[PDB]
Amino acid sequence: EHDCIFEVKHEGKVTGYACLVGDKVMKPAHVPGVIDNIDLARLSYKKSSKYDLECAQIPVAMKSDASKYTHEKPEGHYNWHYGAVQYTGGRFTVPTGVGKPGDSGRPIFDNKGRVVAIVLGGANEGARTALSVVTWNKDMVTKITPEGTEEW
Amino acid sequence: EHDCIFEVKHEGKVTGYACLVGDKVMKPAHVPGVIDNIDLARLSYKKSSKYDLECAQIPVAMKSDASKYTHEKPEGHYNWHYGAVQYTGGRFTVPTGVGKPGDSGRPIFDNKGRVVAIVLGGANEGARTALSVVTWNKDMVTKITPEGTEEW
Amino acid sequence: VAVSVVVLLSVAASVYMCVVARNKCLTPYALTPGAVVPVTIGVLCCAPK
Numbered sequence: 001e002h003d004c005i006f007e008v009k010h011e012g013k014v015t016g017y018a019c020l021v022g023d024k025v026m027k028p029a030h031v032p033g034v035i036d037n038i039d040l041a042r043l044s045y046k047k048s049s050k051y052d053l054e055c056a057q058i059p060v061a062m063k064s065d066a067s068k069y070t071h072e073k074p075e076g077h078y079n080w081h082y083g084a085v086q087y088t089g090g091r092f093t094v095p096t097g098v099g100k101p102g103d104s105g106r107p108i109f110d111n112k113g114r115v116v117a118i119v120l121g122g123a124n125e126g127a128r129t130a131l132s133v134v135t136w137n138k139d140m141v142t143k144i145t146p147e148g149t150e151e152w
Numbered sequence: 153e154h155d156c157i158f159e160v161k162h163e164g165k166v167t168g169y170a171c172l173v174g175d176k177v178m179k180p181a182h183v184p185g186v187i188d189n190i191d192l193a194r195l196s197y198k199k200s201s202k203y204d205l206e207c208a209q210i211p212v213a214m215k216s217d218a219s220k221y222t223h224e225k226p227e228g229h230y231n232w233h234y235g236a237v238q239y240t241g242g243r244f245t246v247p248t249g250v251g252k253p254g255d256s257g258r259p260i261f262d263n264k265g266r267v268v269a270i271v272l273g274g275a276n277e278g279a280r281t282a283l284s285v286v287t288w289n290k291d292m293v294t295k296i297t298p299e300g301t302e303e304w
Numbered sequence: 305v306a307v308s309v310v311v312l313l314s315v316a317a318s319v320y321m322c323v324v325a326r327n328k329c330l331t332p333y334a335l336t337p338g339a340v341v342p343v344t345i346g347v348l349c350c351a352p353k
Contacts, residue, residue, distance in 0.1 A: 053335050061277040
């Protein structure tokens with residue numbers, strides 16, 4: 001697999017995603033439910049309140065082929081599951097409304113594949129939409145949600 | 153290539169593989185039965201339980217038979233006695249699952265001749281295997297392990 | 305009996321608030337990819353590094 005999604009499925013249907021990075025299975029705590037995979041369920045997911053994150057440590061030998069995290073971001077064009085994101089001046093946008101209302105754990109990475117941020121959702125503003133994100137970077141985690149961007 | 157790595161023998165069986173760099177004979181401290189070369193084994197070595205290392209002081213007549221080294225760890229992929237090694241994000245892996253118990257003692261190189269890692273034990277996961285080495289940092293030398301190992 | 309129960313509850317509230325302060329303090333280190341857990345290890349549960 002290369003798509004980190006590992007679909008978080010609830011009541012048989014799906015409700016979002018989660019990613020596996022570095023040593024950690026992180027779930028956006030904004031989403032309710034468990035993931036589709038079986039053996040990734042017996043973990044003590046720690047809960048952060050003020051920003052939604054539900055990290056837990058990987059177990060032993062759990063095919064640690066995860067993506068690579070580089071705590072830096074030059075400005076330009078990065079890769080995204082649906083297309084190509086533009087990053088300029090600390091603002092972080094894409095085409096408007098093309099993203100579905102439920103892509104809720106999709107990460108972002110460079111041309112090479114060096115992941116940096118994770119996603120929370122979008123809104124309807126114009127042709128360019130503001131991507132509300134929590135993000136791991138600068139050797140910590142933080143949240144940048146704009147005004148008016150309601151969660152996906 | 154061949155840079156005089158020295159085995160430990162007992163009863164007809166060889167696992168322990170000492171190496172010697174600069175002035176110091178660095179030996180992993182497993183599988184006793186000290187080396188066949190008695191001109192190099194009559195030396196009272198100092199043992200460190202924290203770092204699992206043996207730190208015998210070379211005899212002066214062996215002035216030439218060692219290697220060069222380095223106190224910095226550049227970034228990329230390297231070679232070793234078996235295959236390739238990939239060192240990124242501050243940690244090592246080994247090429248694809250080939251290691252066996254008793255290989256504790258081979259050194260790891262760069263693309264131009266120096267020597268950095270000495271391997272004690274490792275962790276099986278699947279595709280790209282993990283391993284614990286002792287390595288240099290500007291005369292302040294530590295140990296680093298992955299989590300999930302069996303000592304080799 | 306009143307002073308005994310208020311001593312009990314005051315101690316319990318102090319301990320509860322101290323441990324939840326520690327728990328809030330440790331949280332942004334377990335979340336991020338890349339463990340650092342700096343020189344303040346004296347109150348720490350993050351062992352393996």
